[PDB]
Design a binder for these strands. Structure first.
Ligand SMILES: Nc1ncnc2c1ncn2[C@@H]1O[C@H](COP(=O)(O)OP(=O)(O)OP(=O)(O)O)[C@@H](O)[C@H]1O
Ligand SMILES: Nc1ncnc2c1ncn2[C@@H]1O[C@H](COP(=O)(O)O)[C@@H](O)[C@H]1O
Ligand SMILES: Nc1ncnc2c1ncn2[C@@H]1O[C@H](COP(=O)(O)O)[C@@H](O)[C@H]1O
Ligand SMILES: [Zn+2]
Ligand SMILES: [Zn+2]
Lengths: 378, 378
RNA sequence: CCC
């Protein structure tokens, strides 16, 4: 008696995700037997057929777990089912959840309904079986669909510090990018490359005016907040001063200058609120030597540099160990959910009840405040 | 020789229903091992306030099927999953459907996504194992949720002859009962007793002015139609003309006397259109020698006999042998789903693909049009 | 609010 396998389902987002983990030693990272992600945008490019997310998951979760089980050769083998319970569109959630319930009942095996974000949080620990980073740590999630700063004290205890009020970073970046006629799968990945290439070049006379909501450095309300929806409007009007119309016949020298400044400012804003948080509550961060930057936009170098430079020498004699997962794990996927559930199962010895329905809005601090949880055995 | 068991799921109504069937022999009727129904009420008024039916289904399917699998003694025994694909609310539907698919992937067994009404039509064939009634036959579906007349030429070939354009006879005999001073599970069944207990003792001088959906003249739907939502009103307008709440404090002789007439005038309307359709389309019925009347309200004895007598009018295109299934089969349940699945699997050698999604509104004629179906090896 |  040693080793268990885990079937993990993620459906909070646009992409249906299924994975299988062989948790062969409680001493070692699990091995990934199967990792399937069938996206809403992957049936569109070579598709021109636009589907609705809850229907996408409904249609793809069956064949996907079927494929996964075959690839993994593990149908008669799963021990735990983990599944994203919230937060998200409760249609898209019920897709995965009600299905995951099917597996569990059919197999007579435990189900864990997991916090989407706890996945993002806990993923950079899978690599080392939860030795790095050790709690407490802080984690900046920066995806197309979240932008949040989170102190994590224990597995059963997490506090959101700073959080967006409008859209997420990647969204607004992608949006700015698309207004400059980028089209790609990841619009802002493309726009970094663009800036990267011809640096000592771009019209240094172009100095557009972008904001960075520093009011929280004066009129402080109730919680601290990121905010990105202001950027695309600020771009448009700066265009509407100097050639919005020129959209097209600007040089492949200038367009690469609107880019770097749009990026710089929006990364300035994050750094601004990050600064304003650590400054104001040194007590909480006293005890933490590690900083995670997971999510999509983790993989930006300009950001990574700013983070390492403009923070990790401001908390006095407590540099930060920055850890950046592979964006192999940073995008939504069902692996994080699997890992997160191994951590719950092992460390709390909790599972979910079969009556758990989805949770539209699920504050991370309410992780175990909600019903569903029961102790496993002892 | 070999037999097989079926797990069948019905999640289209308000009630969460699951069944296991032993299809032990292809020359016998199958037996039921397990049949449960978690009615929406039992987790509302005795819990908190009124709960949405999709969350009901989501909350109850899993515990419910676990139990049924325990009772049936067959968690490892199921060879086929039958579940209601449509028609209804896609949130309700998809609770059971997404779940059902989970069972199917985990046990690696076929799924059949079943049409609710196919359920009701076929169920009388269950007991005789497909011999009685023989195709063609017509069926009259009179539940709290349907009032519909149907010709059935083959498993895969059903044609709706007349259908309600508003509420169903049940919903209508219920509100009428509610207004006469009744409550309960079957508000209208009760109304039957009140007049039954003392069939003679009723003020034979209380004649009431109820209508019969006044449209034998001014309407251009290509198709014949029932309607009931007038009767509640007619009754009210009438109870004005000769004493409001009098009902509540009238003799045994009067509460009944009007109830008999309301119950008459509704059945009258039903026999009326039933007659229209038998008259309009004579040779549609050429070889029909069987009339099934099923659904909640089919248990009523004035109906049963109005049917028997008033389409013995002049026995013409056919002389009908009536069949009235029990109420434990007529009211929504998962057994009829399971049976429909048997029929489909065995006769048509068909199953559903795991990509099947709900269908909100599913024409019975389109039973096999829609996507999903796939041949075993006919 | 809600499939
Ligand atoms: N006005 C409408 N426009 C588009 N779809 C509609 C409309 N009214 C009803 N629908 C139907 O309802 C569903 C779409 O709406 P719904 O909000 O339930 O889906 P969604 O946008 O993907 O949300 P969620 O993912 O949270 O369930 C589909 O099943 C669709 O057929
Ligand atoms: N180098 C990069 N610069 C800017 N955005 C990026 C980069 N790499 C990835 N992204 C963004 O990452 C997001 C992916 O979100 P998710 O799939 O949730 O990680 C997309 O919106 C991308 O535009
Ligand atoms: N003996 C009866 N006479 C008239 N209506 C009935 C009788 N029994 C049950 N019903 C009705 O059955 C309906 C519910 O539909 P069903 O889904 O078939 O149970 C309710 O409207 C009841 O009032
Ligand atoms: Zn995410
Ligand atoms: Zn029904």
């Amino acid at each position: 008696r040693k080793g268990y396998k885990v079937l993990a389902i993620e459906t909070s987002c646009d992409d249906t995700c299924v994975s299988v983990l062989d948790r062969f030693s409680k001493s070692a990272a699990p091995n990934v037997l199967a990792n399937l992600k069938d996206t809403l945008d992957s049936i569109d490019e070579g598709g021109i057929i636009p589907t609705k997310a809850h229907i996408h998951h409904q249609a793809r979760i069956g064949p996907l777990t079927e494929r996964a089980l075959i690839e993994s050769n593990a149908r008669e083998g799963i021990d735990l089912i983990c599944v994203t319970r919230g937060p998200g569109m409760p249609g898209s959630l019920s897709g995965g959840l009600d299905f995951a319930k099917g597996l569990a009942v059919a197999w007579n095996k435990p189900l864990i309904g997991v916090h989407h974000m706890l996945g993002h949080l806990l993923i950079p620990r899978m690599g080392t079986n939860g030795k790095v980073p050790q709690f407490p740590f802080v984690s900046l999630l920066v995806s197309g669909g979240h932008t949040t700063f989170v102190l994590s004290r224990a597995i059963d205890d997490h506090e959101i510090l700073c959080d967006t009020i409008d859209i997420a970073v990647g969204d607004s970046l992608d949006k700015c990018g698309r207004e400059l006629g980028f089209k790609g799968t990841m619009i802002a990945r493309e726009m970094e490359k663009f800036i990267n290439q011809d640096i000592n070049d771009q019209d240094f006379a172009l100095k557009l005016e972008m904001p960075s909501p520093l009011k929280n450095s004066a009129s402080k309300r109730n919680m601290l907040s990121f905010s990105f929806s202001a950027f695309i409007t600020a771009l448009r009007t700066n265009l509407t001063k100097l050639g919005k119309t020129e959209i097209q016949e600007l040089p492949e020298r200038e367009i690469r200058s609107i880019a770097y400044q749009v990026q710089e400012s929006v990364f300035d804003h994050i750094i601004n609120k990050l600064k304003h948080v650590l400054k104001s509550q040194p007590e909480k961060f006293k005890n933490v030597r590690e900083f995670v930057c997971s999510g999509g936009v983790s993989s930006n170098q300009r950001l990574r540099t700013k983070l390492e430079t403009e923070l990790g020498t401001l908390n006095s004699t407590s540099f930060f160990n920055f850890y950046y997962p592979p964006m192999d794990l940073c995008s939504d996927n069902s692996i994080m959910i699997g890992w997160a559930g191994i951590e719950i199962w092992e460390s709390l010895r909790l599972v979910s009840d079969l009556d758990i329905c989805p949770i539209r809005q699920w504050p991370l601090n309410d992780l175990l405040s909600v019903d569903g949880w029961r102790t496993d055995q002892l």
